[PDB]
Amino acid sequence: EPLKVEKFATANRGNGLRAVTPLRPGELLFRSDPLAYTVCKGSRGVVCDRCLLGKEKLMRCSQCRVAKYCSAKCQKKAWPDHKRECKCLKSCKPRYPPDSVRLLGRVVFKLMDGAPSESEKLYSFYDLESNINKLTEDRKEGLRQLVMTFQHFMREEIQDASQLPPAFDLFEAFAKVICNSFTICNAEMQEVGVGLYPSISLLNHSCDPNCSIVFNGPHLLLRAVRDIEVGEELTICYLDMLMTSEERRKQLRDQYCFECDCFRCQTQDKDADMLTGDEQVWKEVQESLKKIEELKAHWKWEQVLAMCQAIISSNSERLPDINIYQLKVLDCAMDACINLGLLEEALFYGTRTMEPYRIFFPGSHPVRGVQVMKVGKLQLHQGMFPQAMKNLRLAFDIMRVTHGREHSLIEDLILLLEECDANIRAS
């Protein structure tokens, strides 16, 4: 069709995207493959470099032995976009670069060797915001070190400026990567990769947005989650919803170089509920969650579960499940149990997250959709059919909006709804 979205110059947040026609919840607004992407640090060698799906066995690239793939088809299909980095990842073993450096190498190779990318239809890498005039001296130093890391990692393939795009400035490129990288999660909402999607990068931030993004492998779908009028700006939430206004302030400053004066931030909306319970306990839980989240990122489920049980079933003082640090611990324990086949225990943690997720993901949000699906799935396979049906329907009501027919997970949910329904039809 014609596009439902268009680029425009906002009054005080740079370029943005606005509706061309009225949009309804669930409407597919745009979709994109990445300009460039890579598997993230914790998922390297756990999921396929190309399709970002996990497998019992992954097969390595023989030349570098860093890239790993689910199948001959994926290894072969990845080769054009892996060929030049392969030499650099070999040449610099056992040093592995930061994800941003691997990502930027892929950018450069794509812009030098590939045809114009469909991912740049509305806006290109060259156009992206860098916020160079807002960077602090401390950030500038961090970028200088990323520049030198790139230069080191890439030296086999990029020796000088003749191998970069015209007038390409690596410092500026890394400044763009910082505030335009997308975090790719798998169907289970586990972080698996990072990518650039330059058309999609037009979206500005809201702490109460009107659109959502979801990933199906590296593919990104942008959908409305509220009614949107002609000319109204499209927004997504850049951040985890389980954050206070103070935490959002620090990240939006540090990473994005802006201040938010939205109603939520002006009123510290939900902050008090999020921090209920004794501060001494939740401070310790927040500290333990650095490690728990590190372990989870590397798919270390037994270690995750052990740390989480030490909190959830502590001998010492406990927190309410609506406290965000307690909730994140429940979440990690649920995902660990699911991955370990401890299904009764998974369901216990999962069920406890349901009411806090209802409060903290208002309206239609993909993370709540997927969490409710997980809990309904656990109930279904434990033979709890009426309870399962209610959750699976709720999951469908959310995911029909946030995921839609174009996302394969919706097909999975339809099969569970059918199975649940047959079971009730017999009963």
- Please report whether residue 13 would count as binding ligand SAM according to CB under 6 A: yes
**Closest by alpha carbon to 99, among 170, 45, 41?**
41
The distance of closest approach from Cβ of residue 255 to ligand SAM in the complex, given in angstroms and rounded to an integer, is 7
Asked if residue 37 belongs to a known ligand binding site, the reply is no
Residue indicated by tokens 């400044």: 175
Asked if residue 15 belongs to a known ligand binding site, the reply is yes
Kindly state the number of chain residues that form the binding site for ligand SAM, as judged by CB under 6 A: 18
**Closest by alpha carbon to 173, among 138, 144, 212?**
144
Query: How far is the C-alpha of 149 from the C-alpha of 162, rounded, in Å?
Result: 19
Residue 182 touches which of ligand UZT, Zn ion, ligand SAM, none (CB < 5 to 8 A by kind)?
Answer: ligand UZT
Q: Which residue is nearest to ligand SAM (CB)?
A: 14
The distance of closest approach from Cβ of residue 416 to Zn ion in the complex, given in angstroms and rounded to an integer, is 25
For the CA atoms of 300, 303, 309, 311, what is the dihedral angle to 10 degrees? -100
Using a 10 angstrom Cβ sphere, with 0-12 exposed, 13-18 middle and 19 or more buried, the burial of residue 305 is buried
Query: How far is the C-alpha of 248 from the C-alpha of 242, rounded, in Å?
Result: 10
- Please report whether residue 215 would count as binding ligand UZT according to CB under 6 A: yes
Q: What token pair was written down for 3? A: 């596009």
Asked if residue 420 belongs to a known ligand binding site, the reply is no
Residue 149 touches which of Zn ion, ligand UZT, ligand SAM, none (CB < 5 to 8 A by kind)?
Answer: none
Residue 371 touches which of Zn ion, ligand SAM, ligand UZT, none (CB < 5 to 8 A by kind)?
Answer: none
- Please report whether residue 37 would count as binding ligand UZT according to CB under 6 A: no
Q: What token pair was written down for 181? A: 């990288």
Query: How far is the C-alpha of 396 from the C-alpha of 181, rounded, in Å?
Result: 29
Q: What token pair was written down for 265? A: 């931030």
Query: How far is the C-alpha of 220 from the C-alpha of 218, rounded, in Å?
Result: 6
* Cα 247 from chain centre: 18
Residue 204 touches which of ligand UZT, Zn ion, ligand SAM, none (CB < 5 to 8 A by kind)?
Answer: ligand SAM
The distance of closest approach from Cβ of residue 26 to ligand SAM in the complex, given in angstroms and rounded to an integer, is 23
Query: How far is the C-alpha of 279 from the C-alpha of 301, rounded, in Å?
Result: 27
For the chain, helix (H) and strand (E) counts, in that order, are 14, 12
- Please report whether residue 198 would count as binding ligand UZT according to CB under 6 A: no
- Please report whether residue 180 would count as binding ligand UZT according to CB under 6 A: yes
**Closest by alpha carbon to 191, among 55, 45, 41, 68?**
41
- Please report whether residue 126 would count as binding ligand SAM according to CB under 6 A: no
Closest to Zn ion by CB, 113 vs 278, is 113
Interface residue with ligand SAM among 32, 43, 100, 201 (CB under 6 A) is: 201
Contact segment (CB under 6 A) with ligand UZT among 82-90, 179-187, 271-279, 345-353 equals 179-187
Interface residue with ligand SAM among 43, 75, 180, 379 (CB under 6 A) is: 180
Query: How far is the C-alpha of 331 from the C-alpha of 241, rounded, in Å?
Result: 13
Query: How far is the C-alpha of 297 from the C-alpha of 111, rounded, in Å?
Result: 30
Query: How far is the C-alpha of 253 from the C-alpha of 237, rounded, in Å?
Result: 15
Q: What token pair was written down for 31? A: 């979709």
Residue 257 touches which of ligand SAM, ligand UZT, Zn ion, none (CB < 5 to 8 A by kind)?
Answer: ligand SAM
- Please report whether residue 342 would count as binding Zn ion according to CB under 5 A: no
- Please report whether residue 257 would count as binding ligand SAM according to CB under 6 A: yes
Contact present, 349 and 333 (Cβ < 8 Å): yes
Interface residue with ligand UZT among 123, 125, 150, 182 (CB under 6 A) is: 182
DSSP letter (8 states) at residue 363: S
Q: Which residues bind ligand SAM (CB under 6 A)?
A: 13-16, 128-129, 131, 179-180, 201-205, 256-258, 260
List the binding residues for S-adenosyl-L-methionine: 13-15, 123, 131, 180, 204-205, 238, 258
Binding-site residues from annotation:
13-15, 48, 51, 61, 64, 70, 74, 82, 86, 123, 131, 180, 204-205, 238, 258
Residues that bind Zn ion (CB under 5 A): 48, 50-51, 61, 63-64, 67, 70, 74, 86, 207, 260, 262, 264-265
